[PDB]
Design an enzyme around this catalytic site. Structure first.
Site, PDB file in Angstrom:
ATOM      1  N   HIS A 281      -1.926   1.342   7.391  1.00 17.74           N
ATOM      2  CA  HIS A 281      -2.060   1.061   5.923  1.00 17.74           C
ATOM      3  C   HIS A 281      -2.033   2.436   5.246  1.00 17.74           C
ATOM      4  O   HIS A 281      -2.660   3.370   5.775  1.00 17.74           O
ATOM      5  CB  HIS A 281      -3.425   0.307   5.641  1.00 17.74           C
ATOM      6  CG  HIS A 281      -3.865   0.079   4.223  1.00 17.74           C
ATOM      7  ND1 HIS A 281      -3.120  -0.640   3.311  1.00 17.74           N
ATOM      8  CD2 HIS A 281      -5.006   0.448   3.578  1.00 17.74           C
ATOM      9  CE1 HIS A 281      -3.792  -0.675   2.160  1.00 17.74           C
ATOM     10  NE2 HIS A 281      -4.926  -0.027   2.292  1.00 17.74           N
TER      11      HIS A 281
ATOM     12  N   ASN B  84      -8.552   3.352  -2.013  1.00 19.26           N
ATOM     13  CA  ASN B  84      -7.808   2.231  -1.514  1.00 19.26           C
ATOM     14  C   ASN B  84      -7.177   1.520  -2.731  1.00 19.26           C
ATOM     15  O   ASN B  84      -7.533   1.934  -3.857  1.00 19.26           O
ATOM     16  CB  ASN B  84      -8.751   1.283  -0.802  1.00 19.26           C
ATOM     17  CG  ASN B  84      -8.043   0.446   0.224  1.00 19.26           C
ATOM     18  OD1 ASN B  84      -6.799   0.279   0.213  1.00 19.26           O
ATOM     19  ND2 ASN B  84      -8.788  -0.218   1.170  1.00 19.26           N
TER      20      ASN B  84
ATOM     21  N   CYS C 142       0.826  -1.224   0.000  1.00 21.01           N
ATOM     22  CA  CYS C 142       0.000   0.000   0.000  1.00 21.01           C
ATOM     23  C   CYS C 142       0.868   1.286   0.000  1.00 21.01           C
ATOM     24  O   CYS C 142       0.480   2.264  -0.600  1.00 21.01           O
ATOM     25  CB  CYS C 142      -0.921  -0.002   1.210  1.00 21.01           C
ATOM     26  SG  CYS C 142      -0.111  -0.440   2.786  1.00 21.01           S
TER      27      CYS C 142
END
EC number: 3.4.22.1
Lengths: 255, 165
Positions: free
Chosen positions: A200, A220, A30
């Site tokens: 994250h 995301n 990520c």
């Protein structure tokens, strides 16, 4: 004076990457996706769309090294943006897209949802730093490098983060993920219950108010069948889950 | 060694050290900035300075920077200077108490990273200062294994020699 709502997808309609959702695959990358996504958006915004490229998550993920953390086992956004200002990043699109110099090599998968792709598995192995473009592509790896002019942290301040996105485009941030966030589908996320799964990194590209709740608009990198077509909204203004605490961005070299 | 000293002024010092801005780091440290400012990743100004900013490494050590600060992956400033090939920073860190055998969360030591990255003189200096040649990383690999797997013949020869004794 800033508007009550703002969506970079609406402000810079001629910059297609702002609308796009990527898939990091079975890899803890990520940190890399939030950076190349926001860098892609800023290259287009700061060249008034004269340069529109998908920046390579593969290049960043495989060539940065320990300065950026641990590849597919987690990483550090501030040094990812620093690497872009240092060594640059080549272009590179989605898995097997043949877009750019180094398209992503890890296949897409299902993240916390059921679907037609394989389920995501344990963090994979980090791929090798291969400084060569795909055979069908031209220019060379060295000529395909896009460089940042500078990078910087943004203060833990709702107002400073909104001003930065408004003026310069999407930024990268990080937040603590609790297990109820994995089930997100719609609405403004607010942690209620669930164990802590870790920090994250994501891309913040706007803000608004929904159901009486101020929120940040976030992308995301878990594909489009997770969340709200790949995006989510999270409580804004309260450093919720640390979302305003590790924001980083940077200005491209307009060369 | 696991810092998480975080603030507005800390962000400024971390940014100045990663941007190579020597004069800005001197100003922030001369005015009370926390030399071990950190963040949720456990990164400190000295980890940022290890990326080729020798003069900033010297200023932060003069203000008492923790030479063995460990980030969330277990990397110390010495691991990063060894990975990026900065021999003079590796020398100063070792002269200031850096742990030559610091092990990251996936068992990587400074010698594993220098063997993996192909930095021969750094591998030789860590070896001379006590690096463990039998250290196994997460994959059961020793530094010799990584030199071999990465085609760094000269480093593998040196490591092969050291096991011979």
């Amino acid at each position: 004076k800033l508007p009550a709502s703002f969506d970079a997808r609406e402000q810079w309609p001629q910059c297609p990457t702002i609308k796009e959702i990527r898939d990091q695959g079975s890899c803890g990358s990520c940190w890399a996706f939030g950076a190349v996504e926001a860098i892609s958006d800023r290259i287009c915004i700061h060249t008034n769309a004269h340069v529109s490229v998908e920046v390579s998550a593969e290049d960043l993920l495989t060539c940065c090294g320990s300065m950026c953390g641990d590849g597919c086992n987690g990483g550090y956004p501030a040094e990812a943006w620093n690497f872009w200002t240092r060594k640059g990043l080549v272009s590179g699109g989605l898995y097997e897209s043949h877009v750019g110099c180094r398209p992503y090599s890890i296949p897409p998968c299902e993240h916390h949802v059921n679907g037609s792709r394989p389920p995501c598995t344990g963090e994979g192995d980090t791929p090798k730093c291969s400084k060569i473009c795909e055979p069908g592509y031209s220019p060379t790896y060295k000529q395909d490098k896009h460089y940042g002019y500078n990078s910087y942290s943004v203060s833990n301040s709702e107002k400073d983060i909104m001003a930065e996105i408004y003026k310069n485009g999407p930024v990268e941030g990080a937040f603590s993920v609790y297990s109820d966030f994995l089930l997100y589908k719609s609405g403004v996320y607010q942690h209620v219950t669930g164990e802590m799964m870790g920090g994250h990194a994501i891309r913040i590209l706007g803000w608004g108010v929904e159901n009486g709740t101020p929120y940040w608009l976030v992308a995301n990198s878990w594909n489009t069948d997770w969340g709200d077509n790949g995006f989510f909204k999270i409580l804004r203004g309260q450093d919720h889950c640390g979302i305003e605490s590790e924001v980083v961005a940077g200005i491209p070299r307009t060369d | 060694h696991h810092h998480h000293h975080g603030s507005d002024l800390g962000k400024k010092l971390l940014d100045a050290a990663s941007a190579g801005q020597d004069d800005e780091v001197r100003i922030l440290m001369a005015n009370g900035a926390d030399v071990n400012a950190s963040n949720s990743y456990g990164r400190t100004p000295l980890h940022a300075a290890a990326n080729g900013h020798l003069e900033i490494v010297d200023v932060l050590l003069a203000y008492g920077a923790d030479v063995n600060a460990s980030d969330q992956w277990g990397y110390t400033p010495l691991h990063l200077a060894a990975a990026e090939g900065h021999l003079e920073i590796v020398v100063v860190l070792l002269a200031n108490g850096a742990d030559v055998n610091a092990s990251s969360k996936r068992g990587n030591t400074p010698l594993h990273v220098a063997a993996q990255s192909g930095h021969l003189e750094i591998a030789d200096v860590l070896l001379a200062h006590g690096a463990d040649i039998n250290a196994n990383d997460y994959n059961g690999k020793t530094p010799f294994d990584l030199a071999i797997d990465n085609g760094n013949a000269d480093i593998a020869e040196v490591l092969q020699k050291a096991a011979k004794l």
